[PDB]
A paper describes a structure:
The domain 2 of [name] contained five α-helices and one η-helix, which formed a scaffold for the binding of RNA substrates or other functional proteins.
The METTL1570–407–RNA–hsRBFA226–260–SFG quaternary complex structure was subsequently refined to a resolution of 3.1 Å in space group C2221. In the structure of the quaternary complex, [name]–RNA–hsRBFA226–260–SFG adopted a similar conformation to that in the METTL1570–407–hsRBFA226–260–SAM ternary complex, displaying an overall r.m.s.d. for Cα atoms of 0.475 Å. The helix of hsRBFA226–260 and the RNA substrate bound on either side of [name] domain2. Unexpectedly, both the 5’ end and the 3’ end of h44_dsRNA1 bases in the quaternary complex partially paired with the neighboring RNA in the next symmetry equivalent for better crystallization, respectively. The residues in the N-terminus of helix α7 and in the loop between helices α8 and α9 of [name] formed a positively charged channel to accommodate and recognize the RNA substrate. [name] His231, Lys234 and Arg270 formed several direct hydrogen bonds with the phosphodiester backbone of the RNA mainly via the positively charged side chain, while Phe262 and Pro263 recognized the phosphodiester backbone of the RNA via the hydrophobic interactions. The side chains of Pro263, Ala266 and Thr269 recognized the ribose of the RNA via the hydrophobic interactions. Strikingly, the alignment of our quaternary complex METTL1570–407–RNA–hsRBFA226–260–SFG structure with the RsmH structure showed that the helix of [name] posed a physical barrier with the inactive cytidine in RsmH structure (indicated with a red circle).
Numbering used by the authors:
A (entry chain D): 7 to 269, 304 to 313, 330 to 338
B (entry chain C): 2 to 22
The structure:
RNA sequence: CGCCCGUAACGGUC
């Protein structure tokens, strides 16, 4: 819920913040809706999302400063803009995927609406970056299976990986629903809609394989960790860091980070439940 | 790390990405 | 007879 994320940042007057995940601007448009005498910096590697960020900058001139880039390149753009370390009163991280890239089928995130196997948050900014189609059309079985098993938490990895490598040797995979039928074929027609959601809602059987490629082609884990470090250094002592996790890996990474482990600098002040966990930099 | 290397699998994709282009 | 979810005790490699 949005109105309980601002509840943790505690925005007052004169404070300056960083929304490392701008997206459609929900959290940002909720901070100003609480207090307007602030200066928010908006980052998002999605050109479709950053378009709204600077569409709000010309609308809120003395408040918003739009920025386009990944977490991994957030340190360079912050320094090259005139921002020294230890400056932000609060940093916001809303992980996952914006509704713009899941709904609009031309970007190839949804298995519901058909587009190309693209699955890139950056979209067109880097055309040499491999798409989800390039991944399933290159790597071998033992490599594809480990990506699905770890990133996607899929138990039947070798079954799906063998189904991909066999449909590959006949015709390359270049669409979302084309790939969804390949993985669904590894199982009998019964299993296609057997898995239930958190609200006991029916989901496609490819929903985990798609989530693995979503994390692999965008490198959600490695870019998350470097973003946590960057958020720590540009936060001031007493600054608040709110992070919305959406699966075990994104949550275990921020957990091991706030505790200071790899395999004393934070006051962990909130853990709610789709899991939120906020902390204070000292 | 999470087990899977990204730089190793990247050039294996690039060695495929260019043999098509 | 096959699959899925959950649980449970099994065996040689990192
Ligand atoms: N590793 C990453 N580096 C940079 N941006 C990212 C990364 N992962 C996700 N994003 C962006 O963060 C956004 C996540 C969305 N949930 C947006 C949340 C936003 N608060 C909203 O109002 O919807 C997406 O627009 C992504 O483009």
């Amino acid at each position: 819920m949005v109105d309980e994320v601002v509840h943790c940042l505690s925005p007052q007057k004169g404070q300056i913040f960083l929304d490392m995940t701008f997206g459609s601007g929900g959290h940002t448009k909720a901070i100003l809706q609480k207090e307007s005498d602030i200066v928010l910096y908006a980052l998002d590697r999605d050109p479709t999302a950053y378009a709204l960020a600077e569409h709000l900058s010309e609308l809120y001139p003395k408040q918003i400063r739009a920025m386009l880039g990944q977490f991994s390149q957030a340190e360079a753009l912050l320094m090259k803009a005139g921002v020294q370390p230890g400056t932000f009163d609060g940093v916001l991280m809303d992980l996952g995927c914006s509704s713009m890239q899941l709904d609009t089928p031309e970007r190839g995130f949804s298995l519901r609406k058909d587009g190309p196997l693209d699955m890139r948050m950056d979209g067109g900014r880097y055309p040499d970056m491999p798409t989800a189609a390039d991944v399933v059309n290159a790597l071998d079985q033992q490599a594809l299976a480990s990506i699905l098993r770890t990133y996607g938490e899929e138990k039947h990895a070798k079954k799906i990986a063998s189904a991909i490598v066999q449909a590959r040797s006949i015709y390359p995979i270049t669409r979302t629903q084309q790939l969804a039928s390949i993985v669904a074929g590894a199982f009998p027609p019964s299993a296609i809609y057997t898995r239930k959601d958190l609200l006991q809602r029916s989901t496609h059987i490819a929903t985990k394989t798609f989530q693995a490629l979503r994390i692999f082609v965008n490198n959600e884990l490695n870019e998350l960790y470097t973003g946590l470090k960057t958020a720590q250094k540009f936060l001031r002592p007493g600054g608040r860091l709110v992070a919305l996790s959406f699966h075990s890996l994104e949550d275990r990474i921020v957990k091991r980070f706030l505790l200071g482990i790899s395999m004393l600098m934070w006051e962990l002040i909130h853990k709610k439940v789709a899991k939120l966990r906020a902390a204070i930099k000292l | 790390l999470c087990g899977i290397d990204h730089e190793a699998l990247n050039k294996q994709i690039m060695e495929y990405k260019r043999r098509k282009d």
